[PDB]
Design a protein around this nucleic acid. Sequence first.
RNA 1: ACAUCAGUUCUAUUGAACUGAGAGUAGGGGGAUGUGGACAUUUUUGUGAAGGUGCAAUGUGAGUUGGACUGGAAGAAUGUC
RNA 2: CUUAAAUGAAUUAGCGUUACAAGUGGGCUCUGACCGGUAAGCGGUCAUGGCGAAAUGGGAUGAACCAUACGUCUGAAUAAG
RNA 3: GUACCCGUCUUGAAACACGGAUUAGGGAGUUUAUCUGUAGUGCGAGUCUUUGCACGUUAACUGUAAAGGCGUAGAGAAAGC
Lengths: 60, 52, 123, 50, 185, 48, 50, 149
Amino acid sequence: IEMLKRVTPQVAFGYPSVDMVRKLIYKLGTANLNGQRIPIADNQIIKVALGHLCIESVED
Amino acid sequence: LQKIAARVEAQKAAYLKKKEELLAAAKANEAKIQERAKKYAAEYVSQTKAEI
Amino acid sequence: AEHKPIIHKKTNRFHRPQSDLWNRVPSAWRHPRGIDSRFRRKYRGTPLHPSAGFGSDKETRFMLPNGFIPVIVRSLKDLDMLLTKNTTHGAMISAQVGAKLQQEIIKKAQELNIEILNQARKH
Amino acid sequence: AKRSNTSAHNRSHQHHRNIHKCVVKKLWFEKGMNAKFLRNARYAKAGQNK
Amino acid sequence: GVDLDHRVPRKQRQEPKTADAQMKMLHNLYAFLARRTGNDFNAKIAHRLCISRTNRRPYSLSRLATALNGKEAETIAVLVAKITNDERLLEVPKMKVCALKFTETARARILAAGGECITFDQLAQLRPTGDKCLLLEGDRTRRLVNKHFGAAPGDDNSKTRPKVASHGRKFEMARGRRKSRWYHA
Amino acid sequence: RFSLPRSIMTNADIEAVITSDAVQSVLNEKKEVVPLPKCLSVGACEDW
Amino acid sequence: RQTVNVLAQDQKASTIELPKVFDTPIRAEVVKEVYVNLAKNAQQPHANDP
Amino acid sequence: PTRFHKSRKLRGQVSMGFGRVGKHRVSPGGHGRAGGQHHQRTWFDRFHPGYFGKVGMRHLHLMKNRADEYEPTINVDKLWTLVPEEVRVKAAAAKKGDAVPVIDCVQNGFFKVLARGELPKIPFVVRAKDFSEEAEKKIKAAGGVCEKV
RNA sequence: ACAUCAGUUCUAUUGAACUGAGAGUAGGGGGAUGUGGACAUUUUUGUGAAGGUGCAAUGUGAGUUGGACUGGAAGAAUGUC
RNA sequence: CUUAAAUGAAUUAGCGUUACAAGUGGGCUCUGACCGGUAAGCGGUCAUGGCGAAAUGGGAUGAACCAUACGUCUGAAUAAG
RNA sequence: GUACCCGUCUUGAAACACGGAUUAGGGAGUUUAUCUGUAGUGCGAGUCUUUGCACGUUAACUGUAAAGGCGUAGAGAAAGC
């Protein structure tokens, strides 16, 4: 928050609801894997990255 | 080359062993994601009913 | 052969700046190094610079309106180069080659089916 | 004749292109330090290996 | 418009700048292995073949006798360099070695005491994993040019050796080098 | 002064060395790149 | 060691084994660097009127 | 040669890689070692310290074939390098008796001997002009003789 | 959608799929075009060489090539120097 | 030598080291702070930014202000205005 | 609809700053010595064969004896080490 106080003129920000956090990740969501900027496509992308952390598919 | 042409026959089978196995693993996961999506739906609506 | 529709990205040739004005200056392109030059700066109403932006497709590069990529053919011995790549490349016989050997290269080509791009030498 | 004496406009810019942290090799500096301390620190090491 | 630092600080040598057949060939052998076997040994041998001739320092035969003293038989000393014999070492041990080249003095000494004289493409058949191998390298700073490198001489104390044709008194020994003539570095 | 020059390899070519079963047994399997789809992934969004 | 025949003057007279110079590897780069510099030796110095 | 130079690629570029504002010109500093105590002192101070000044004792008519200047050195670790390797193998198999080989340093152009490394326990005889203290000590300990010339 | 330069995943034999970036004076690096002559290798030419004038292609571009008229005897390519 | 117990802020990121060499050593300036001056498009400093080497759009017009910093094209929706 | 004249010193040039009537052909970072550092190549405690001699299808190429250069031990004004 104190970092955001310095940069307040450069950014717009707020507190998104669950329907908005959903709709970003389904439409526009992408995974930065090994510095490649890969599109999210299928849930086997994010099982391989994040399955050890108990996050299996895009809902999780 | 005769040994390599023999050995690729094992790599055909060992490929198709994992093809059967990982598809079977996928169907087990396709059961378990469905309960989580139903959980988080009914967990979200109960969060709203709690505060309201 | 099968290919895309050929599209060039620039139609005309690039002129050097101020080449239209003067006969001393040839119209072959030269990158302008002037300190106060408008052209180096890119202002509006200057020509765009030749650059890797204008590069044509990797499939259709060096490709004629016909279809075929022209290899130059200087003799009967050099015509063996086009035997492998029959319907991708095609022949283009040199201007040095005279009227007698012109007819022999056409007769060799019609046997082996290699399309010759040179046209209408005459007589 | 009379031109500028100095400036610091873009001292900061140049310094930050690269403020590299020069690391010390070891904390002891045996050129300094007490000789009477270091004299005894030799006879600790010399006696031990025998 | 993106804020990145576009410059490259670090190049690295990927393939060798030699125009040989053989150095370029057996680079691709150990490049092929280093990828496919996925191992730390072959990755090093691949990279050592890239690097320039100055860094491939000539690992002498007395250093080879010191390394292998202790180590049991069927243990190759793999070495991406030239081997050069020592005069001063007297009786060579019986030892198994692999390098790019030997000197013809050194090859005589190793063979005459029942040793082995192995090439890198020969070694790729024997030990792909590098099990009971021993990678060695000459020290980088043993070159004479390397002693001129460092803090500039005269920094108190550089210990870097000034670039001079002729040594003795008269050539660079007075005002700077000694405290009698004003100052000492 | 001259003496007769040695080669670096013992063999002429590489391809005999790689194809031998001494090498081949140690190697991992030859991989190949997947091309990735461009597209509803999730099995039940209609609960939401 | 491998062999090559010797033609009779007319024909084959006998078979003689190769000497050990034919072992040594063929080097395009090394033969270039030598020949390029060695061909400069086979030339005449010339200059314009000073 | 003239193809590979950087000058060849700098056609069109107007200054040929030498600046506009400064203008590449023949005498920036002054000639050779000039201004070593003045305006090029920083170069002398930084890279070649001790350049200025006089030190030492003047030597008149120095000759280097005198046996005052001229002493080549050799070391105790070798010596055996001077003799071929068939000799000392025979000298290893010997009693405390006879036939101890003479390693002549002075024929080969080595006057003094200097002990930096080891020997074996073979007997031998060093003919040389001079020794060190430790070189004389090591040759005794191997089991051999120190001749002077 | 396309080009270039990086990189990431792989690939023996020179490549594949995919992601990212975009000003530039003084200045530095990489690859490429053209000219006089040389050494190999391969040719073209009185059924018309080089050169020159106009026109149509082709290359991002330096350039290169075709055909027509003029000319009347030599030119050019590939790899190294 | 060893007896215990763990990787004990956030956000981000590979980090370290060496060699050789170019150009440069006249700067100017918006917004704030400041010294001298009646004041200056004046002289001399400070902090971030800009120009110099930065196009395009906007301020009719303008090196410096605002939006924004650029491969070649085809659209959509915007910024300053 | 857009578009100020190029080259140049300059903080700043369309400038009421200087050079420039037209066209063709000439026209400017080269070479030597003593070194530095990086990369390539050969040999390696060695290395260089050249001053010169012997060869030659002759300024080349080829063969080779012995010195000599630099390296292999340094510090000190020097004795001595």
